From a paper:
α-Actinin-2 (ACTN2) is the only muscle isoform of α-actinin expressed in cardiac muscle. All four isoforms of α-actinin consist of an N-terminal actin binding domain (ABD) comprising two calponin homology (CH) domains, connected via a flexible linker, which allows for conformational flexibility in the ABDs, to a rod domain. Thus ACTN2 is important in cross-linking actin and titin filaments in the Z-disc. We have investigated the effects of two mutations identified from HCM patients, A119T and G111V, on the secondary and tertiary structure of a purified actin binding domain (ABD) of ACTN2 by circular dichroism and X-ray crystallography, and show small but distinct changes for both mutations.
To determine how these two mutations might contribute to HCM, we have expressed and purified the ABD comprising the two CH domains from human ACTN2, together with two mutant variants A119T (AT) and G111V (GV) and determined their structure, and actin binding affinity. We were successful in obtaining crystals for the WT and both mutant ABDs and were able to solve their structures to a resolution of between 1.9 and 2.2 Å. The ABD was in the ‘closed’ conformation in all the structures, as found for other structures of the ABDs for the second striated muscle isoform ACTN3, and the two non-muscle isoforms ACTN1. In the closed conformation that we observed, there is extensive contact between the CH1 and CH2 domains, and the residues Arg243 and Trp145 stack together, as found for other ACTN ABDs. Intriguingly, one of our two structures for the WT construct contains an additional N-terminal α-helix, upstream of the first CH1 domain not seen previously. From our structures of the other WT and the two mutants that do not have this N-terminus helix, this may suggest that the N-terminus is highly flexible. For both the WT and A119T mutant structure, Val112 is orientated towards the interior of the molecule packing the side chain into a hydrophobic region. The measured Kd for the WT construct of 7.5 μM, is comparable to that measured for other ACTN ABDs [∼1 μM for smooth muscle ACTN (ACTN1), and 5 μM for Acanthamoeba ACTN]. Thermal denaturation experiments showed that the thermal stability for both mutants was lower than that for the WT construct.
Author numbering: 19 to 257
Write the structure that this text describes.
């Protein structure tokens, strides 16, 4: 059988940029909450398949108890646990499309990422409201107001606007000028600018280093779900 197939099989071990980014960011986001429950996940495509840490995540971020988990390794107990996590998200206003317990238990990557995004959106971004603007659009207007003074920043979206890292440094500088010497930063060191903001955010604001920096700089259009997840932590930290 052909060498050509074998080489392309190996090539499937590279995740597309959008997955790398969502994987890194949504894993760190889940972990910055699960640590209040004394646990962590390591691999987002594997560690929600039994429904247990998913139910716990939902409890930690909602503050409300979910019904008791099924105990037992049998596959229908994992299905019952994930159904409880998804029924709880539904009950909180999220209309789920193309997402079901069966594919989550089977490790479906796009579906598992999509589910976690619906959680991040509902419990971190949905209720953001600035000047009669809610959710994604409200978080964006917020970023625009905070960064308006900064002439080397133009927040117009949750992707390309954020590539050079200056948008992140400005959000910090506006709220905490003591923490950053903004005037010394420029557009030629985007990787530096990103890792700097993330290092400052981690040390002083308790926000883990969620972003895939290399991919943000090098990908034509960064993943906006990942960037919204990270920026949503700055909003909660500053408001």
């Amino acid at each position: 059988y052909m060498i050509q197939e074998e080489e392309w099989d190996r090539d499937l071990l590279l995740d597309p940029a959008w997955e790398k980014q969502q994987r890194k960011t949504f894993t760190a986001w889940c972990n910055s909450h699960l640590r209040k429950a004394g646990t962590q996940i390591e691999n987002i495509e594997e560690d929600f398949r039994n429904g247990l840490k998913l139910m716990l995540l939902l409890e930690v971020i909602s503050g409300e108890r979910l019904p008791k988990p099924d105990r037992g390794k049998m596959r229908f107990h994992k299905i019952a646990n994930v159904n409880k996590a998804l029924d709880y998200i539904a009950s909180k206003g999220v209309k789920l499309v193309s997402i079901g317990a069966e594919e989550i238990v089977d490790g479906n990557v796009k579906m598992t990422l999509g589910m976690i995004w619906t959680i991040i959106l509902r419990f971190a971004i949905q209720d953001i409201s600035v000047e009669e603007t809610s959710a994604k659009e409200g978080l964006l207007l917020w970023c625009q107001r905070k960064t308006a003074p900064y002439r080397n920043v133009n927040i117009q979206n949750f992707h390309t606007s954020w590539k050079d890292g200056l948008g992140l440094c400005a959000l910090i500088h506006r709220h905490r000028p003591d923490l950053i010497d903004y005037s010394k930063l420029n557009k030629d060191d985007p990787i530096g600018n990103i890792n700097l903001a993330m290092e400052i955010a981690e040390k002083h604001l308790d926000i883990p280093k969620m972003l895939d920096a290399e991919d943000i700089v090098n990908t034509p259009k960064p993943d906006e779900r990942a960037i919204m997840t990270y920026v949503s932590c700055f909003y909660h930290a500053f408001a």
